[PDB]
Each structure stands twice: as structure tokens, then as C-alpha cells.
Amino acid sequence: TLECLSRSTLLCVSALTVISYVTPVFLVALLPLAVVCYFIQKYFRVASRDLQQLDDTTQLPLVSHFAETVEGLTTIRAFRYEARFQQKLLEYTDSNNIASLFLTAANRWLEVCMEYIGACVVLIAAATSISNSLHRELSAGLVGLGLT
Amino acid sequence: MLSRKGIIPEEYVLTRLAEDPTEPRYRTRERRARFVSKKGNCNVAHKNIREQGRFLQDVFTTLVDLKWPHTLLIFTMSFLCSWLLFAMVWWLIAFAHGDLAPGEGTNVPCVTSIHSFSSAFLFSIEVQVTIGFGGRMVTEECPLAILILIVQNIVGLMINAIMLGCIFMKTAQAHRRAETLIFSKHAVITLRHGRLCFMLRVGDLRKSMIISATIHMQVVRKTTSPEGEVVPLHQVDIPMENGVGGNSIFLVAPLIIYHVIDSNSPLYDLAPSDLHHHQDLEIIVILEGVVETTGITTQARTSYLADEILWGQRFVPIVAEEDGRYSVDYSKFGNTVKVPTPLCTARQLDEDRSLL
Amino acid sequence: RRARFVSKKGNCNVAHKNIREQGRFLQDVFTTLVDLKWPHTLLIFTMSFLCSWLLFAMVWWLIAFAHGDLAPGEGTNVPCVTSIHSFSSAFLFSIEVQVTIGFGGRMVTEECPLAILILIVQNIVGLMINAIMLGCIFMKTAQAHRRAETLIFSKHAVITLRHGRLCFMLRVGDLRKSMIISATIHMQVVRKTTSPEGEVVPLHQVDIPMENGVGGNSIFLVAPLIIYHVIDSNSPLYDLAPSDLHHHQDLEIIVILEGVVETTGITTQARTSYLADEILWGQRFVPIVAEEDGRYSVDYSKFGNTVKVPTPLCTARQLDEDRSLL
Amino acid sequence: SIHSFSSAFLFSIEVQVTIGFGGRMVTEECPLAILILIVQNIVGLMINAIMLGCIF
Amino acid sequence: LSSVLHQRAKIPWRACTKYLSSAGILLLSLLVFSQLLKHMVLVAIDYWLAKWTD
Amino acid sequence: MPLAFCGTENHSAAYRVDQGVLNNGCFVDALNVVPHVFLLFITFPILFIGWIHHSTWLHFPGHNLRWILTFILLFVLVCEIAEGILSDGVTESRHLHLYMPAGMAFMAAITSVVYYHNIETSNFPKLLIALLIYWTLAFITKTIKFVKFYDHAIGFSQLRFCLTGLLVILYGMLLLVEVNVIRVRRYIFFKTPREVKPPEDLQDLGVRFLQPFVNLLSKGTYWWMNAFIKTAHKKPIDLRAIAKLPIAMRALTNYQRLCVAFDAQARKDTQSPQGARAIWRALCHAFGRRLILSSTFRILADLLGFAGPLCIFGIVDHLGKENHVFQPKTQFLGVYFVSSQEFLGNAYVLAVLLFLALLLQRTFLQASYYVAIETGINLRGAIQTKIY
Amino acid sequence: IVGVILLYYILGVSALIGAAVIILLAPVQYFVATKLSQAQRTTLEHSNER
Numbered sequence A: 001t002l003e004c005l006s007r008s009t010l011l012c013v014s015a016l017t018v019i020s021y022v023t024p025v026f027l028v029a030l031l032p033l034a035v036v037c038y039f040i041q042k043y044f045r046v047a048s049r050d051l052q053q054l055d056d057t058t059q060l061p062l063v064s065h066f067a068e069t070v071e072g073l074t075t076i077r078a079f080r081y082e083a084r085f086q087q088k089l090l091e092y093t094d095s096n097n098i099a100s101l102f103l104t105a106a107n108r109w110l111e112v113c114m115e116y117i118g119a120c121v122v123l124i125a126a127a128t129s130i131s132n133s134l135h136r137e138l139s140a141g142l143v144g145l146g147l148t
Numbered sequence B: 001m002l003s004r005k006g007i008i009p010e011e012y013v014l015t016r017l018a019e020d021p022t023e024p025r026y027r028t029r030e031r032r033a034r035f036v037s038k039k040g041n042c043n044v045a046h047k048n049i050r051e052q053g054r055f056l057q058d059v060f061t062t063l064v065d066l067k068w069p070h071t072l073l074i075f076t077m078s079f080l081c082s083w084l085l086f087a088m089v090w091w092l093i094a095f096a097h098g099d100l101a102p103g104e105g106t107n108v109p110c111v112t113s114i115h116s117f118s119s120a121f122l123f124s125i126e127v128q129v130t131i132g133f134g135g136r137m138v139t140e141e142c143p144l145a146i147l148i149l150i151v152q153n154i155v156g157l158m159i160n161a162i163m164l165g166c167i168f169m170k171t172a173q174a175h176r177r178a179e180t181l182i183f184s185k186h187a188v189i190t191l192r193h194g195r196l197c198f199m200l201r202v203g204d205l206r207k208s209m210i211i212s213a214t215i216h217m218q219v220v221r222k223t224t225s226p227e228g229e230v231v232p233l234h235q236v237d238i239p240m241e242n243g244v245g246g247n248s249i250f251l252v253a254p255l256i257i258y259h260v261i262d263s264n265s266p267l268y269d270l271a272p273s274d275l276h277h278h279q280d281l282e283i284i285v286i287l288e289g290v291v292e293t294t295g296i297t298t299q300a301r302t303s304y305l306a307d308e309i310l311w312g313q314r315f316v317p318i319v320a321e322e323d324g325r326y327s328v329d330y331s332k333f334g335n336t337v338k339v340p341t342p343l344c345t346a347r348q349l350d351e352d353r354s355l356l
Numbered sequence C: 001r002r003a004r005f006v007s008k009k010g011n012c013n014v015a016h017k018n019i020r021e022q023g024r025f026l027q028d029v030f031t032t033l034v035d036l037k038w039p040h041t042l043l044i045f046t047m048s049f050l051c052s053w054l055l056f057a058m059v060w061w062l063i064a065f066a067h068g069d070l071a072p073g074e075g076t077n078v079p080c081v082t083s084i085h086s087f088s089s090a091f092l093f094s095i096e097v098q099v100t101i102g103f104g105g106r107m108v109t110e111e112c113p114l115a116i117l118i119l120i121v122q123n124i125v126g127l128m129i130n131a132i133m134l135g136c137i138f139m140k141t142a143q144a145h146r147r148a149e150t151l152i153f154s155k156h157a158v159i160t161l162r163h164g165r166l167c168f169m170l171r172v173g174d175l176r177k178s179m180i181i182s183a184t185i186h187m188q189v190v191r192k193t194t195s196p197e198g199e200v201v202p203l204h205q206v207d208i209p210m211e212n213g214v215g216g217n218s219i220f221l222v223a224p225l226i227i228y229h230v231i232d233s234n235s236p237l238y239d240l241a242p243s244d245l246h247h248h249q250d251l252e253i254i255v256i257l258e259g260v261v262e263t264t265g266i267t268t269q270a271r272t273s274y275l276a277d278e279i280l281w282g283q284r285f286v287p288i289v290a291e292e293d294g295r296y297s298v299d300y301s302k303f304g305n306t307v308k309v310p311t312p313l314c315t316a317r318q319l320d321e322d323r324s325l326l
Numbered sequence D: 001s002i003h004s005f006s007s008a009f010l011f012s013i014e015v016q017v018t019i020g021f022g023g024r025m026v027t028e029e030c031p032l033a034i035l036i037l038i039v040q041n042i043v044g045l046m047i048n049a050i051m052l053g054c055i056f
Numbered sequence E: 001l002s003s004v005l006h007q008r009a010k011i012p013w014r015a016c017t018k019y020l021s022s023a024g025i026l027l028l029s030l031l032v033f034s035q036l037l038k039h040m041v042l043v044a045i046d047y048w049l050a051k052w053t054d
Numbered sequence F: 001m002p003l004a005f006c007g008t009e010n011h012s013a014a015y016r017v018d019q020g021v022l023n024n025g026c027f028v029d030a031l032n033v034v035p036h037v038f039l040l041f042i043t044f045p046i047l048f049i050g051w052i053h054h055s056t057w058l059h060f061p062g063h064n065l066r067w068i069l070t071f072i073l074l075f076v077l078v079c080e081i082a083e084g085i086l087s088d089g090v091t092e093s094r095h096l097h098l099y100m101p102a103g104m105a106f107m108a109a110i111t112s113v114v115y116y117h118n119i120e121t122s123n124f125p126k127l128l129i130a131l132l133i134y135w136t137l138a139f140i141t142k143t144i145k146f147v148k149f150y151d152h153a154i155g156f157s158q159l160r161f162c163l164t165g166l167l168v169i170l171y172g173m174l175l176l177v178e179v180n181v182i183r184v185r186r187y188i189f190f191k192t193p194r195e196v197k198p199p200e201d202l203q204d205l206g207v208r209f210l211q212p213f214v215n216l217l218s219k220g221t222y223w224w225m226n227a228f229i230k231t232a233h234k235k236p237i238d239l240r241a242i243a244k245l246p247i248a249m250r251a252l253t254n255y256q257r258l259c260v261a262f263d264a265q266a267r268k269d270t271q272s273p274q275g276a277r278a279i280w281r282a283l284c285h286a287f288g289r290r291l292i293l294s295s296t297f298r299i300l301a302d303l304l305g306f307a308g309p310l311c312i313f314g315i316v317d318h319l320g321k322e323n324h325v326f327q328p329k330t331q332f333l334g335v336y337f338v339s340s341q342e343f344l345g346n347a348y349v350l351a352v353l354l355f356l357a358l359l360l361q362r363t364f365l366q367a368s369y370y371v372a373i374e375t376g377i378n379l380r381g382a383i384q385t386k387i388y
Numbered sequence G: 001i002v003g004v005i006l007l008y009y010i011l012g013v014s015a016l017i018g019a020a021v022i023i024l025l026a027p028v029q030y031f032v033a034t035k036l037s038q039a040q041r042t043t044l045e046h047s048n049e050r
């Protein structure tokens, strides 16, 4: 995680540095996005850890219940309480699955929001770069570097 | 790619039980729902309601009962859009008749001195608002021009009529959207004249008093009848112990809504043991009435829980007789102080009279 | 079939006949214009404005014709109204004067006093028509805010056992989000009763107490409530019997919910009727309000659903008297 | 036909009251003039509504 | 409220100091410089490509 | 010099009416502006006035055929705006009729979906008449323009003809959608409106994962998660906040689906010991209807993601040409028409197409992810129940 | 498949020749991944005993 975080964050700042160097106007356009991005980042983190922690907690009972049902199968069936235990599992399985489903929904919400933000950067970088090359005669290779 | 989960191990783990954290926030939330809020905002989920059809009159009514800044935006947009829509079609007619074409004195345009869309916008403004400068004016033999002029005037009259009606009813009704009636946060059960009484304080924050104030108090309880009936929110009306037994109350200086808990009163078995928060014992006090200035009947409901009822407490006296007038210290309005009082049950209190 | 006193919705199907000559004055026809529907009011007002514009357009054209102004050929005689050369121009001038656009291309002149007099008439008629139009708009706008009939009653009422004692019972519900201040329940028995002196009243209405805690007719509807009257010796239902359940049985119960709506600030009425066949013995109303973590929940699907319960299939006169013996 | 503040005062009188004599009129090629005409018309109408509402 | 604010603390200084103290003085600065050095070259090779392709 | 709708060619002689007004290319363009201007003015005060929730969650028929049609209709309108701006580059005159009609058509289309969405939530279908009297109004005039382009023999070589011929079909397709709503719900000039109620899954207040019950755009955007994420930042997430999952995802419902697949897989195949092949067939038959949907989204997502590199190639290739000479090279009827072979050669047009393709690609890729995850999570629930 | 075809269209027969190195090195990564899991299993067995 430490290695991936460092590489991911270094790749990110490298990209913004190149786009700002390619088109200085992007620096101005970086002010709004870097504002909203923080909000997306800040809110998601609070919504992630809780969800992640909640997911882990909800895995403990379900799997434990499975172990009990094999260590005490004779007593479970003798009491004629199989139907209640089946209902207990279904509640446990539903609780774990919805914890996992919401985590995926939170992951997807962040991914789509960051994808739109990155798509907006592409439009901003492209528009400024073509304008620079048509009028101020920016290098063609620099335009390619900005878009890539 | 740049994620820690390039390959998922999915290996089993052996972590012993550790459930309770330091923070008690997991079990801290234990509030129980109430069908009437403290601020009088009752909230009951009317789930599974038969789909009554919606009508355009509801939208029209929503326009009437909107806020003030919103009404200005709606009407400004309505006026501006009406002028703009008609300016567009005025431009069409001039274009289709060749008026917008370059200069030619032979033909007579459907609208005189109409050249561009800017003139068309100005002509529509003059016609709809009835300014009528006259530099741009309608001409004859263009029946479409006469027809649209009739349509624009008819549309303008109906739009203006709606604006006057909306404004006229706004000043009448929106003035009566203020609730300046304050109850006490916590009620008491005290010992007045030997008989137990449930008391609460209500005051008026508006100088003009409420005319013909009627007070309704109801105990809400899931009272299962002995015969077998079960009802979740049964309401039992409670008397007022007024000077005549009625429900009329005069509101000039805040007073105490004291009801003597007797055998008829369902509170005959009230006890501090059943005073805890999770007990189904809730009081609803409703002071209906009409404000003199406007004439619209006003209602202000309040709900008192058992936990919100303080047993054996007395309300602080409020009205001080100054030299000229009476002083009301509203700071100590809903402040209740303890007093040495019997703490038994009103049902058990009947033995004290029997013993004596 | 069987005749009804008031319909289930509350239409109150009764027939009036042999009424003396009503006034039928002029002032009532305006009220007819007030209570017109939205499409009809628009049609009535568009017709009124168009007729006014057209009628005056004809008379301006006639005045121009009478003065000999629209005849081709320029003359020194100044026309009564300038720039009038057709009836279409006359129609436009009438539009300009009445709507008060006043372009000024066609303008009144000091030539003839007939034009001046008729200009006054057009303006006053135009001003009074706008006043009538604005007056009708105000009255009709209140009708939109009215939204009167939105209260619900069970299709069938019950006779059940509450607190041990038999009682007639029905259900009342308020579908509206807004509250109904100063609510009032009035229960009445519509019967054909005979007097011991020979009087035979056709439709006798007897008041029925609501068995409230304060001994009053006031209620408070936030959730669907059970309105029940304890059938005792002080009620005309004390002589009820299971045989009084046929469709053509001489009985009827009317429940009236008066009360001013908080938002509108006007009184609304909701009359409902329960016939003998709509009175179900041995049934109870299922509890509706279910506690929830967020807010109290009300299941309106089961508003009229009932559960059968064994109740004494006897007469209240014999049932209450037997209590002392038992 | 705008030549002084007196003429400008008369033009505002004509528009807000909606008289529109026509000697002084709004032309094109001046979008700022058109915009304030819309603003003044809206302000004049809302004032009338307040006056009519207050009279009621 | 207060518990949520206390719970939602990343504790960056404590965790970073534990890793930094355990790693020492040499192997900590080396990783920071090495990772930064690798990525500055990646920007450079793309930038050099732009100049060459120009 | 002043901004002219038709233009300033030959002393503004493009406004002539002779030889029929409908034969004037400017006027048929102007007629197209009108339905968009009508809807903007008509529904703007309506949206400003209205400005549990289960009772207002019913989805109109064709809930998906409307959003996908709007998006493709939005895409062709963006292309129309881009093409029109290319067309007036040659002449000095502004020629506002090339793009402004199309430009505010895109604006009017946005308001139509907003207005329809408000009607979709607030179950007031009686208002879904403005769109009807608009769609045919937006179709009739467009057909006139199309026929006129066929009258002057424009042909498919010109890009405007292709876009107009495609855009009229899109208007036609959703016009069928609007009358389809009328046919099912039967609220206009009908006798008995058919009763449609919200799904019973959301009627209980115990459903908070409202992913199945939401508009298509929010299905692909996860806009419903904003309320939960904002709520999370204040109240820590407890099981009370995450109310139980809808009936479509419940463990019991999944097991019923898994059980029914096994009966089909073991009935015809008598010699089925319920081995690997039988279980694999059971898994495929039970969850194939969703795995294919994930694959279809994923395959489309992969294809669109490649348009980015192609867009860069086109952009930089056009920029490397130092000549920077652009011209449509033809004027069909006094208005210059650009061809498709040059429309996708412009740098700004290609950049806009790249931005639009990126938006579509990322939505499809993320949509495929969630569909696969939901199937994977649902299988886990079903598999665990069967094992237990 | 779309990637390699598009690479050939853009850079000719040089991109395909060069991109084969990454394609051919992927099975080498597979061997490393499969042996990395084996090494993880050995540590997990020892750690579980501990």
C-alpha cells in the first residue's frame, strides 16, 4: 500500500505538472477541479473506512455461525429449530452482502466522479493546447505530451 | 494496475473476538419515535397510500403559496418568457412577409418599422406591456398580424391577471404563517390544593392575543382493551380543571395548564416508576384559536413524554406587580423547581383520604 | 333498491320539490361566472374581450363611414380619427384604445364630438371589463386553493366490544398532509320513529354522543382514528338486533367531520353514511399504526380491513340487563 | 428625442406608467438600453402589484 | 459528534513516525529520493520524446 | 457587421421570400428554432413552481428507451453545433442560422429530459402533453428541413444532410416513445387510466440501496450515493442507516433463482450427478442474463477507450501541418457545407469528440464493473445458502 | 487484439515487433505470480504455527 500510494500520487502530480507546463492556462483551470476533487476525496474517505470496517465486522458472525452449525448439527436438528437457523443465516448473509454492496457503490461513485474530473481535464488541456499551437505556435510534440 | 489488489490472496484469518470499542457511540443512539414533535411538527409515515390523481390545480396552488423571492423569480421569468416567445413569432411573421428583407417601398409590412429581432423584441414588449410607442405598429391586410396581436393581448391579460391574483392572495395568507406560541419544554406533576395536578406553561409572543383559545389535551397510549381490543395510538381526552369545566383559556400572560388527576383521569395510576423514557405515556396539548388581526384559526400542538415530565416540581412565579403594570420575566418561563411533595401514586393517594 | 338519505361519498341525494318562486335576480348570474371551470372561464373571458373589441371596432368603422372619411380621395376635412382606411384599421384602433396600447398611428382628432363621446364609452367599458375580469380571477383563485374533499371513511362500520361494552364504531382518516384545526365529529341516526301520541316523523335524526373523554365532539386527526359511540340505555341503538341488517332495514348512521383546514383557514365538511348492510357485527378494526425507528408508520391499505371476533349476538336491552344478574 | 434630464424624466414617466407617447422611444443597436427597459418594466409591474396588494 | 471527530483521525504523525523510526535514517531518505528520482525521469523521457518528435 | 441570423451576404439579400418562403434555407432553419423556444418558455415557469418517496418512484413505460435516445440525440446535436461553426468560417458574415437553431435545440433537449424526469418522479402524467405537442412540433419542422435538403439535392456527401437525416429519425423514435406512454397509462382523452404502482420492494422503508429503482443516468452515475456519502460525513454508518437490500438482491430470492436453475439442469440431463459440469451450467443459466450485460458494457467500454488514442493522433496530425489552412471548399445554396472527411479533421471538433467519447467510455466501464460485482455478490449469497 | 492491430496501423511493423516483448514477458510475470503465492503460503503456514 505504501509503495502503491507513493507511485500513484507521484504519477498524479507529474501529470498535472506536465499539463500546466504544456498550457499555463490549465493552472487557472486547476483551481476549480483541485477544489472539488478534495471534496470528493474527503467525503469518500469518511464513507470508505466506516464501510470497510463495517464490512469486516459483518463477516465475523456469518462465518462463525457456519462453524457452529457443524459442531452442533445433532443438537440443532434435535431441537427442531432448523427453520429458525436458516432464517438466522439469511439475515446474516443479507447483512454481509449489503455491507459489501454499499462499499462497491462507494467505490464506483468515486471512480465515476474522478473519471468525469479527468475527462474535464482532457477537454481543458486539449482546448488550451490547440489554441496555443494555432496562434502562439506551440510545439506539436508538446501538444501530444499534454494529451497523453 | 496502480492498486494494491493486483493479486488477491483471499487467505483465511484467525482473529479472536474484540467487539466493544472505547467509544459507546454504537449503543448511544436509543431514541424512540414520536407521532408529534416538540416543535409541533407531527411526522407519521403515511405509507402505502392509494394513488389519488394529481391535477394542474395543485401546481397552480403551489404557485400561489410559494415564497416571496421565488414568486418574483417565477413572475419575472413568466413575463420575460412571454415577451420573448411572442417576439420570436413576431419576427417570423415579418420574415415570412419580407419585412426583414432589404429596403423596398412598394410593399407595406405587417408591422411597420420592424427591421431586426431587436425591434421584434421591443415591439413585443410594447404590445404586451401596452406601452405602445408607435414607431413600430401593426398594419392592415395582414390577417396573421391581427390574429397574433389578439392572441398576445389575450395572453398578456391572463398572465397579468394571474400575477395580480397571486400577489393579492400572498399578502392575505402568507402573513398568517408565523407561530409565536411557546409551551414549556418539560411539564410537571405537582400537589395543588391537595390533589395531584399535571401542569405545563404556555405563553404568547405576539402582542395581539388569540381570540377564543381552545385547549385540547390527550393521552396517547397503546391501550389494549380488556375485552381483547388492541389499538396502537389510542387517544384519551383529558379535562381542563378550568373555572367552568370548559376549554376556553385567556392568553395575555402565560398560565399553567393544570389538570387534576382524578379517577376519571387516565393519569390516576401515574407513577415516577413509569416515568422513564421508554414508557408509553405521552401527553399532547393543543391550543387552537383565531388571531384577531387576520382571522385565520391557528393551531400549535406539543407533545410531552414521560421522560420530559418532571414529577413533584413547581413552576416559578412569573408576573411581578410593579407600580404601574405587571412585569413578566420570560427568562424563567419554563423553569421548574423542586418542592417537598408526596411522591406516591395518585391511585395510592386515595388511601390517604380514606385513612384521614 | 333502497332509498338513501346521504350518499356514501357525501353527495346527499335528496329531492326538493314544491318550492315557491325563487328570486332569480341578476346578481346571481355573476356567481355563475365566478364558479366556471378553468377552460370555460378562459373561453368566457376571451369571448367577452373579443366581443368588446369587435363591437367597438364596428362602431368606429361606422363613425368613419358616417363622417365620409374612408371614401377615397384626400380632402381638407380632418377625419374624426386619423389613419383609418378600412375596417381592419378600425379594428386595430379599437384594440389600441380598449387594451390601452395606444400606438398613435391612428389617433383621435378634435374633428367630431361623437368620436370623443364614444372614446369615453370604450375606455369605461374596457376599464369595467378588466375590473370584472380581475374580480372573477380573485374569486376563482380561492377555489383552486380550496381542495375540499380529501377525507376518507371506511366502506363499512362495525359493532364491536370496547372496554367490555358494545359500541358502534367507524374509522376516519385524513389523506391530506395539512392538518384540520377545530375538528368536530357529529354522529346521527336517521330513522323512521313513531311517537306515543300518533306522530310519525318521516326522517327523524337523533344526535349520538361520541363517547369522548371530555364528553365533547372535538377530535384530533393526525393518524387514522376509531370513532366509537357506546351503545347504552341513552341511545336509540339500545333496541338493536342482529335482524336489523337487511339492505331495506329502516336504519342509517351519518358521521360528519366539520373543521377548518389550517392552511386554507376555511371550514370543510365530510358527510358519510353507513346503511344496515354496511354495519358489520362481530368485526374489529385491525391496528394500523406500526412503530418504526424513523417515524410512526401508517398502513392505509388496511384502513377498512376487519378481523372477525365473537361478540354477543343478543339485544343490548337483554345484554346490559343480564350483566346485573351475571 | 433625448436632449436633457427633463426629457429623460419624461421618458421614464412614459414607460413606467406605460403611457408611451412615442416622441421618445427605444431603438435598436443599443442592447444596454433594451436591458434596462426590461428591468424598468418588471420593476414597474411589481410596484403596481404591491400597490394593488396593499390597497386590498 | 465529538466521538466522530475523534474517530475520524488518520493519525498520520504517529503512524509515519513509527515507520520512519523503525526504518531508520538511511533507508527512509533513500526511498523518498529514489521514488522521486524514478518519476522525474519518467516525466523527462516523455518531455524528451516531445522535443525529439518535434 | 451586426449579428445577423441569415447573414450579411450580398447586402443582406438572403432574407428574400420570393419563389416561396419555405424554399428559403434560412426560414426552414428559423422554423426549427420555434419548437425549442416554445418548450423553453412554456415549461420554465412550471419547473420553477414545483422547484414517503416510494409513492413518487413509479417509472413510466420506456424508461430506458427515452434516456438513451436523449443521449444519442444530445450527441448528434453537439455534432450539429460543431458542424455549423465549421460552416461559417469561410465568409465574413456571422451566419447565425448555422448553429444557433441546433445549439438551443440541445438546450431544449436538456430541459425536456429534466421536465420528463420531474414528471417521472412526481406521478403527474397529465403534464406529459407539452413534450408530446413538442416532439411532433420538433419533428414536423425538422422533416420540412430534411425534405428541402432533398429538394435541393444535397445528398449524403454533405455532413448536414447526414446529421439532419439521422436527427429526424431520433425525433421520430422518441415521438413513438411519447405516444407509447399514452397507450399504456391511458391518461389523455382516455376512459380508464391503467393503474401503475411503485414496486413493492421500495414500499417498505427498509430499502436504502435504491440502485434498481433510479433513473438510467443516475444508474450509470450513482447519483443516489451522494445523499449517503454526505450523511456518512456526519453520522457514522450503522446498520440502521444501511437498511436491508431490495428483494431483487435478497439471499432467499437468489437461492430461489439458483434452485430453479438446478431443476432445469437436472431434469433433461438424467445422468447428472450434480458435478462440476452441472454446477457450472447451473451458475451460467442462473446468472448469464447479467454476466452478458456486464460483458456487453465492458466490450463497448474497451472499444470507446481506443478512440482517445485515435483522437490524439488526429489532433496532433492536424496541428503538425504548419499551413493551418481551413476551408469547407463549397457553398451549396449560399451557405458553405462542410464534408465528413473534414469534420473529423478539425482539431477542436476532434477534441470535443474525444471528450464526449471519454465520458461515454468511463461510464460504460464503471457500469460493467458494478454489474459484474452485483452478480458476483449475488452468487456469493446464493452459494453460501446452498452450502448451508 | 484491437491494441496490437491499431499499433500496426500507426507505427507499422515496428510497434508489433516491439510490443511482442511485453506480450512475451507476461507469461514470465505469470510464473512470478504463481511462485509468489507459493511463498506466501509458506509464510502463512509458519505464521499460523507461530
Ligand SMILES: CCCCCCCCCCCCCCCCCC(=O)OC[C@H](COP(=O)(O)OC[C@H](N)C(=O)O)OC(=O)CCCCCCCCCCCCCCCCC
Pocket: B054, B055, B056, B057, B150, B151, B154, B155, C037, C038, C039, C042, C043, C046, F126, F127, F129, F133, F188, F189
Ligand atoms: C382568437 C384567439 C385567442 C386566443 C386566446 C386564448 C384562447 C383560449 C381558448 C380556450 C381553450 C383553451 C384551453 C386552455 C386551458 C388552460 C388550463 C386548463 O384549464 O387546463 C385544465 C383542463 C384539463 O386539463 P388537466 O387539468 O391537465 O386535466 C388532466 C387531469 N385529469 C386533471 O383534471 O387535472 O383543460 C385542459 O387542459 C384541456 C384538456 C384537453 C385535453 C387534450 C390534450 C391535448 C391538448 C392539445 C391538443 C388538442 C387536440 C388536437 C387538436 C387538433 C386541431 C387541428
Ligand SMILES: CCCCCCCCCCCCCCCCCC(=O)OC[C@H](COP(=O)(O)OC[C@H](N)C(=O)O)OC(=O)CCCCCCCCCCCCCCCCC
Pocket: F064, F068, F069, F071, F072, F074, F075, F076, F078, F166, F211, F212, F216, F217, F219, F220, F221, F248, F356, F359, F360, F363, F364, F367
Ligand atoms: C450518430 C450518433 C451515434 C451515437 C453513438 C454513441 C452515443 C451513445 C449515447 C447513449 C448511451 C446508451 C446507454 C445505454 C444504456 C442501456 C441500459 C441497458 O441495456 O441496461 C438496462 C439495465 C437497467 O435495468 P436493471 O437495473 O438491470 O434492472 C433491474 C433487474 N435487472 C430486474 O430484474 O429488473 O441495466 C443498466 O442500465 C445497468 C446500469 C448501468 C447504466 C449504464 C448506462 C449509463 C450511461 C451513461 C452515459 C453518460 C452520458 C454520456 C453521453 C454523452 C453525450 C453528450
Ligand SMILES: CCOc1cc(CC(=O)N[C@@H](CC(C)C)c2ccccc2N2CCCCC2)ccc1C(=O)O
Pocket: A104, A107, A108, B001, B003, B005, B006, B007, F369, F372, F373
Ligand atoms: C473490490 C474489487 O471490486 C472491483 C472489481 C473490478 C472488476 C475487475 O476487473 N477487477 C480487477 C482486475 C484483475 C484482472 C486484476 C482489479 C482489481 C484491483 C484493481 C484493478 C483491477 N482492474 C480492473 C479492470 C481494469 C484494470 C484494473 C473493478 C473495480 C473494483 C473496485 O471497486 O475496486
Ligand SMILES: Nc1ncnc2c1ncn2[C@@H]1O[C@H](COP(=O)(O)OP(=O)(O)OP(=O)(O)O)[C@@H](O)[C@H]1O
Pocket: B182, B183, B184, B185, B186, B205, B330, B331, B332, B333, B334, B335
Ligand atoms: N424569553 C423567551 N422568549 C421566547 N421563547 C421563550 C422564552 N423562554 C422560553 N421560551 C420558549 O419556551 C420553550 C421552553 O421554555 P423554557 O423557559 O423552559 O426555555 P429553555 O429551557 O431555555 O428552552 P430551550 O432549551 O428550548 O431553548 C421553548 O420553545 C423556548 O423557545
Ligand SMILES: Nc1ncnc2c1ncn2[C@@H]1O[C@H](COP(=O)(O)OP(=O)(O)OP(=O)(O)O)[C@@H](O)[C@H]1O
Pocket: C018, C019, C020, C021
Ligand atoms: N316552498 C317555499 N319556497 C320559499 N319559501 C317558502 C316555501 N315554503 C315556505 N316558505 C317560507 O316560509 C314561510 C312559512 O311557510 P308557509 O307554508 O306558512 O307559507 P304561507 O302561509 O304561504 O306564508 P306567507 O303568506 O307569509 O307567504 C313562508 O311565508 C315563506 O317565507
Ligand SMILES: Nc1ncnc2c1ncn2[C@@H]1O[C@H](COP(=O)(O)OP(=O)(O)OP(=O)(O)O)[C@@H](O)[C@H]1O
Pocket: B048, B049, B050, C152, C153, C154, C155, C156, C175, C300, C301, C302, C303, C304, C305
Ligand atoms: N389506502 C387507502 N387510501 C386512500 N383511501 C382509502 C384507502 N383505503 C380505503 N380508502 C377509502 O375508503 C373508502 C373505502 O374503504 P375500503 O378500505 O373498504 O376500500 P376499498 O375496498 O378499496 O374501496 P373501493 O373499492 O370503494 O375503492 C373509499 O372512500 C376509499 O377511497
Ligand SMILES: *[C@@H]1O[C@H](CO)[C@@H](O[C@@H]2O[C@H](CO)[C@@H](O)[C@H](O)[C@H]2NC(C)=O)[C@H](O)[C@H]1NC(C)=O
Pocket: F009, F010, F013
Ligand atoms: C448574392 O451575392 C453574390 C455574390 O457573389 C451575387 O453575385 C454577384 O455579386 C456581385 C457583387 O458581390 C454583383 O455585382 C453581381 O451582379 C452578382 N451577380 C449576379 C448574377 O447577380 C448574387 O447576385 C447575390 N444574390 C442576389 C443579389 O440575389
Ligand SMILES: [K+]
Pocket: B129, B130, B131, C099, C100, C101, C102, D017, D018, D019
Ligand atoms: K398603456
